[PDB]
């Protein structure tokens, strides 16, 4: 049963350094897989022992890299599943089978997420209109080049100044022939007048409806609230996590300060500290629409799902 | 204006084409009415009338003395130089659009400039504009000494031994003066420029701004090299053989010839150029080489890679091989050897 | 094939004297963690898994601490073999030794003791592979290096590097240090070798992450005269007439690998790793699961171990790895510090730029600067210090006593510029 | 004559009218080297100008004015042809050249407009060299008055504001802010500083140097991280590369965004500017005057990923580099100027006189 432990390591490591896997929903999938293995390579006197074990493991997971809590909420929902099963079917052993199907169920639903969102797109964006996006958020490449087969419009993609992370989407939408444009984040307020409804990615959905986003997003949402054009969060619901913003501000992945001011610059690096947060906050009171697996949703709406998805008694995990 | 097309040229524009005149010609194409053209007066006036033999309405002739080194003649002509000079060497045969080097100069207030097409290893900058060193193996035996200062300031240096510069130096009046007091500095190319680069380091400092080139060069002791030029020359002659009494039967292979020239029968020419108004009309063949006029030619010149200059003759039994025609050749038949020979 | 990495945990720049008395050089706590750890996390990051460490002087303490390594767990990916040999004191012998037991299969990555790095060798590793087996052993070594600028505090007064290299295959052409050379010396050997461009650089770090190849163990055995890597590279660069098979240099652009050598280098690298310059590696990631290195990263680069009981009104502007177990009083104005575990502090104290460690202690009103301490190093009221003012091995200073710059006091008269005391003078 | 360099590719559909230039089309690639119709000092200026060797708007003024000093002092009038007319007539192609190598900023605009006004001013009883000498003197009077003494006055006003204990945000190569900070530090104040820069012409460096090499503790971060720092900053502090008519304030791409995030974090927005930069056209819009410099420079550097391998072959992809945004009046509460610590919306009055 140590092969389980070695796969656990393999992940925990690939997690604990940097981009891996470079896709988010992928991370979710490998997560669920490893969880399934934890179950199918273990037994329990009572399901409480399995709850305990998966809680320990999820603690290691989220504590390792609290910047990406996706897997945090995956183990949360798995705790929900076992909670629900021991609730129903004892309110004893064969229910292991039960558990497994749930995973598959969850799993298979996950496999449709992207395409689900696709169906919404063809509704919102009426043609020849201007949409703004910050990043290469796969869900949004899906969104747009899946609503660019019946209409035509204009998407301007900003650029997270740390990376070129807001250029790959430009080259992709070029490969999809939509006549999109590139720009430098500092100029978003420059053109925020001529936007219609910003379509932004997201990286988590706190239980306050406050999304932690790829950096250079707080300014986008603030410019939006100013011009009062609406915010289109392309957040599949698995990206939730029942964190409520204020704890300890282990909050923004502080990536290699090499990014902003590269090391080539002489001695000035002796009294010049550096900051480079790749993930910023956006207050929920600016959100408009949680385009999601179940269609339109508003800020408050989100805790409803946090009511149902993750059993509240385990946000301390 | 801010310049003077002063041309440090001594010692003739041979071929079917006024070669030596061409630095002039080309700078004339881009403004630069004034052209100071120092002449050769080590014996007599054998150079100015040769310029009266040309077609540029604005040229100037400057006599000289026994020996005139580059910086020496610089100091010599120094008084009449009342701007930022633009010196230039003899054999500029090079289609470089000079706007690039003066571009760089006029940009970064450069105390100098020069060109380098592709002895004399140099150190050029990362960006390839502010060079940082020049020398040759003659200067010093082996040690590429570079004073740690510049590597402590200019961080990354590329090198170049694969260069053919063209002795073309946009200057600044005060450097001409700095030379004028430096009586001992004899020659720009050998001593001046490396001295200046040496004094680049002990914004009111000095500048040096080289340039890499891949288009054409400056001719030297092998002038058959500019047969390359010849092959290419007609392209330069797009709107600036070409005109002669042609045969259209004899071998024409990248040939050149002036009008009123050797038009006869039974000749040939293979991948080279010719002279103008000479005696080559009898049963002849190619020579894969170039000739100057006044060399009577006849009887199947089975030669290759040589020169038939003035003071030469051949007739009715002739055959050669890579044996140049210098002075003292009243010949009609001399079977030559392809090795080094100038008869 | 697997990727095996020779490694020696005794860098023979034996400069951390007298500090080398108590605990050996490599084991040093830089940010409350073993440097050798940093190195091992590196090795794991580039993905090497059979690492052969080596320590001759003080191997005992090395094994003592490394038995509980991040990679001495059975679950580890790295296997380690502390071959406790105390014969060599120059790397030459250990390289001929990895020859002497055929340890390195092929294509290894030797590494000095305490390189701080985050570098992914795989780009290099593979290009080395390419021009070594699409070129069939014409290589022997493919130096890796990291672009920088000379003025940075990475190149202390002691050590820089300047190197001639080619630009086509990026092969080394000459390597040499510059300890006070207002000029330099390069032979035309460079150009009589080739007429297609040569480059000189002074903007590469002393990365000391030489990729190599067991035929390097050859080149060391076949000639018993090399004692350091520089010996190797200059010997091979002069012996190019025959059987050179030169070095294929290569520089990176985005990473940070420094073979910390001297106390100034330790200073620079510690107060740059606190600034996350190497991230992934920084103690709030607690990469060694070792318990007490739970570091609760917080506002404005202030790190904070658990239970620090930080003192009222004690401002801390930036880069302060307050370790575990600490405790602090009123107004203690710390800055750029590294406060290890077991560190009681007084009041009104300033500790700019200091590097405390475990066991250390200090009373009220005791200004310090540019400092350094060690186990149970103690300074009482209103003492003061200056640059590089080391003091280790539980040394004490009495009240009222200022101290001059190089005040390296320790447990020995003859080597330290003082001796174990509880005043200032009088050993 | 002087052709107009190609408007590089196509722009945003909306941006089709403003120009988009480059740097490889170095306009001197075609002219006559001995600068015959084009003025020598002028072409030197324009050439070192287009390729991007003069950036700071105030520095760009200083440069232009030095070059025109040279032009004037070398100028000659035709046979008994009146200076004020014929000079300006030579000047028009020269200013057209300066434009067709790089769009003209409001600072240079007010400068050249003043110079036309003043050349047209001096009477037709002009002893030639006397006229030119008086013009050199007046030009240097202008520069010393409005940009060499101004900086001093602005500092004298500002220093009394910046307290001790209070960090301050900065943005970009603005000479004036570097000067303010340096000075009011030298007069003994004690405060951290944080700089924010905006890609592509990453420029905060300039001030970062001129600060850390002057003693003041700094801290760097890019503008897509600005939302992070504001819970600490007690004063933003922004340059102003031009000042418009309707109270607004133009600046580099990354200014109004700073101001906005600031207002939303409730932190008092200063700005610093000197009079003569102030233009007179009006804009609360965004695309009325924002030159589009060579967008090709924008292409990033990662891995081997030049994610813009071709700006061109990807006909579905278009670039832009908006040089300026325009902070609306309401945001930036205090606009220090050499006349006082006026509030922003009242800037047209004390500048219309």
Numbering used by the authors:
A (entry chain C): 8 to 98, 126 to 351
B (entry chain F): 1 to 11, 28 to 134, 155 to 238, 258 to 295, 342 to 444
C (entry chain I): 41 to 467
D (entry chain G): 166 to 518
Passage from the reporting paper:
The overall binding modes of eIF2(αP) in these structures are similar to those previously observed (Adomavicius et al., 2019; Gordiyenko et al., 2019; Kashiwagi et al., 2019; Kenner et al., 2019), and the subunits’ conformation in the αPγ complex are almost identical to those in previous structures (Kashiwagi et al., 2019), but with improved resolution. When the apo eIF2B and αPγ complex structures are compared, the binding of eIF2(αP) is associated with an en bloc rearrangement of the βδγε tetrameric unit of eIF2B. This widens the gap between eIF2Bβ and eIF2Bδ that would otherwise accommodate the eIF2α-NTD in the catalytically productive conformation (Kashiwagi et al., 2019; Kenner et al., 2019). As a consequence, the Cα atoms of eIF2Bδ helix α3 (helix δ-α3, residues 247–267), which intensively interact with the eIF2α-NTD at the eIF2Bδ-side of the gap, are displaced 3.2 Å (on average) and its helical axis is rotated 7.9° away from eIF2Bβ (the root-mean-square deviation [RMSD] for the alignment of eIF2Bβ is 0.7 Å). Contacts between the γ-subunit of eIF2(αP) and eIF2Bγ observed in the αPγ complex may contribute to this difference, but their significance needs further exploration. The rearrangement of eIF2B induced by eIF2(αP) also affects the pocket for ISRIB.
eIF2B is an ~500 kDa decamer, assembled from two sets of five subunits (Kashiwagi et al., 2016). It has two catalytic sites, each comprised of the bipartite ε-subunit whose two domains embrace the nucleotide-binding eIF2γ enforcing a conformation that favors GDP dissociation and exchange with GTP. Engagement of unphosphorylated eIF2 in this catalytically productive conformation depends on binding of the NTD of the eIF2 α-subunit (eIF2α-NTD) in a pocket between the β- and δ-subunits of eIF2B, ~100 Å from the catalytic site (Kashiwagi et al., 2019; Kenner et al., 2019). When eIF2 is phosphorylated, the phosphorylated eIF2α-NTD (P-eIF2α-NTD) engages eIF2B at an alternative site, between the α- and δ-subunits of eIF2B (Adomavicius et al., 2019; Gordiyenko et al., 2019; Kashiwagi et al., 2019; Kenner et al., 2019): a catalytically nonproductive binding mode that inhibits eIF2B’s nucleotide exchange activity (Kashiwagi et al., 2019).
